[PDB]
Design an enzyme around this catalytic site. Structure first.
Site, PDB file in Angstrom:
ATOM      1  N   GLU A  78      38.607  33.654  29.870  1.00 28.55           N
ATOM      2  CA  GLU A  78      38.919  34.186  31.188  1.00 28.55           C
ATOM      3  C   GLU A  78      37.684  34.034  32.068  1.00 28.55           C
ATOM      4  O   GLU A  78      36.631  34.554  31.714  1.00 28.55           O
ATOM      5  CB  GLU A  78      39.313  35.666  31.056  1.00 28.55           C
ATOM      6  CG  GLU A  78      39.956  36.321  32.284  1.00 28.55           C
ATOM      7  CD  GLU A  78      39.989  37.847  32.157  1.00 28.55           C
ATOM      8  OE1 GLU A  78      38.976  38.427  31.765  1.00 28.55           O
ATOM      9  OE2 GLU A  78      41.060  38.456  32.438  1.00 28.55           O
ATOM     10  N   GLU A 172      41.463  41.721  41.946  1.00 28.82           N
ATOM     11  CA  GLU A 172      41.647  42.510  40.742  1.00 28.82           C
ATOM     12  C   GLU A 172      41.161  43.931  40.974  1.00 28.82           C
ATOM     13  O   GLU A 172      40.108  44.129  41.571  1.00 28.82           O
ATOM     14  CB  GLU A 172      40.899  41.913  39.546  1.00 28.82           C
ATOM     15  CG  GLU A 172      40.946  42.830  38.324  1.00 28.82           C
ATOM     16  CD  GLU A 172      40.445  42.177  37.049  1.00 28.82           C
ATOM     17  OE1 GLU A 172      39.717  41.172  37.137  1.00 28.82           O
ATOM     18  OE2 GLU A 172      40.782  42.679  35.955  1.00 28.82           O
TER      19      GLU A 172
HETATM   20  C1  LIG Z   1      40.965  39.860  32.784  1.00 32.78           C
HETATM   21  O1  LIG Z   1      41.915  40.226  33.809  1.00 32.78           O
HETATM   22  C2  LIG Z   1      43.076  41.038  33.464  1.00 32.78           C
HETATM   23  C3  LIG Z   1      43.666  40.660  32.080  1.00 32.78           C
HETATM   24  O2  LIG Z   1      44.327  39.409  32.174  1.00 32.78           O
HETATM   25  C4  LIG Z   1      45.755  39.421  32.171  1.00 32.78           C
HETATM   26  O3  LIG Z   1      46.203  39.430  30.799  1.00 32.78           O
HETATM   27  C5  LIG Z   1      47.652  39.429  30.682  1.00 32.78           C
HETATM   28  C6  LIG Z   1      48.226  38.161  31.343  1.00 32.78           C
HETATM   29  O4  LIG Z   1      49.644  38.164  31.247  1.00 32.78           O
HETATM   30  C7  LIG Z   1      47.803  38.130  32.818  1.00 32.78           C
HETATM   31  O5  LIG Z   1      48.290  36.939  33.436  1.00 32.78           O
HETATM   32  C8  LIG Z   1      46.275  38.165  32.894  1.00 32.78           C
HETATM   33  O6  LIG Z   1      45.860  38.188  34.255  1.00 32.78           O
HETATM   34  C9  LIG Z   1      42.590  40.573  30.974  1.00 32.78           C
HETATM   35  O7  LIG Z   1      42.849  41.563  29.982  1.00 32.78           O
HETATM   36  C10 LIG Z   1      41.168  40.749  31.533  1.00 32.78           C
HETATM   37  F1  LIG Z   1      40.197  40.447  30.537  1.00 32.78           F
END
Ligand SMILES: *[C@H]1OC[C@@H](O[C@@H]2OC[C@@H](O)[C@H](O)[C@H]2O)[C@H](O)[C@H]1F
Length: 185
Positions: A78, A172
């Site tokens: 990420e 976010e």
């Molecule tokens: C970084 O941002 C939030 C989260 O990412 C999500 O995880 C689930 C997925 O379905 C989404 O599309 C993502 O944005 C992650 O836990 C964090 F590290």
């Protein structure tokens, strides 16, 4: 360019009023949330992409990030390019700095344990960060030359996966409230 991806994920906490606007425009109204990520961009990220954006509204009331956001697989990573934030400036293991698009960014790496990912469910994964030393003013046409960050990360042993997932200019928020209005192209 025209965006073809709409990102709208929330862990279910609080209120997240995400609006899929015209073209590359979107807005978010949130309050007392858990973690959420909203934004517009491309279904398939690219290390050579140049992202343009204009945040007409950036009003976080607590922890919030205005940042380029995306994922890769093989390995699962990420990544972020944070231009502005709310009350908390994200940091981690300092790796160095990179100058790009008029600003200086610190490079950090962190790790998430048993956290949700794009693959669903929960797992452990690394996070790559580029965080501006000072908040980038908003309301103006801003550019993020991603190639500069990718190259900087590489020289510090931070290599991205071979399978590229979405790539968006997002908002976010984490256990906070606020408003944002961003146009991506
Ligand atoms: C970084 O941002 C939030 C989260 O990412 C999500 O995880 C689930 C997925 O379905 C989404 O599309 C993502 O944005 C992650 O836990 C964090 F590290």
């Amino acid at each position: 360019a025209s965006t073809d991806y709409w990102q709208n994920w929330t862990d279910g906490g609080g209120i997240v009023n995400a609006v899929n606007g015209s073209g590359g425009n979107y807005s978010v109204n949130w309050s007392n949330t858990g973690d959420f990520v909203v934004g517009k961009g491309w279904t398939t990220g690219s290390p050579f992409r140049t992202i343009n954006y204009n945040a007409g509204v950036w009003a976080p009331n607590g922890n919030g990030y205005l940042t380029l956001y995306g994922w890769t697989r093989s390995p699962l990573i990420e990544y972020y390019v944070v231009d502005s934030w709310g009350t908390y400036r994200p940091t981690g293991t300092y790796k160095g700095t990179v100058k790009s698009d008029g600003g200086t960014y610190d490079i950090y790496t962190t790790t998430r344990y048993n956290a949700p990912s794009i693959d669903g469910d929960r797992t452990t994964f690394t996070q790559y960060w580029s965080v501006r030393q000072s908040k980038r003013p908003t309301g103006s046409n801003a550019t993020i030359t991603f190639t500069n960050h990718v190259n900087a990360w590489k020289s510090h042993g931070m290599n991205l996966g071979s399978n590229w997932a979405y790539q968006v200019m997002a908002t976010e928020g984490y256990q906070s409230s606020g408003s944002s209005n961003v146009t991506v192209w």
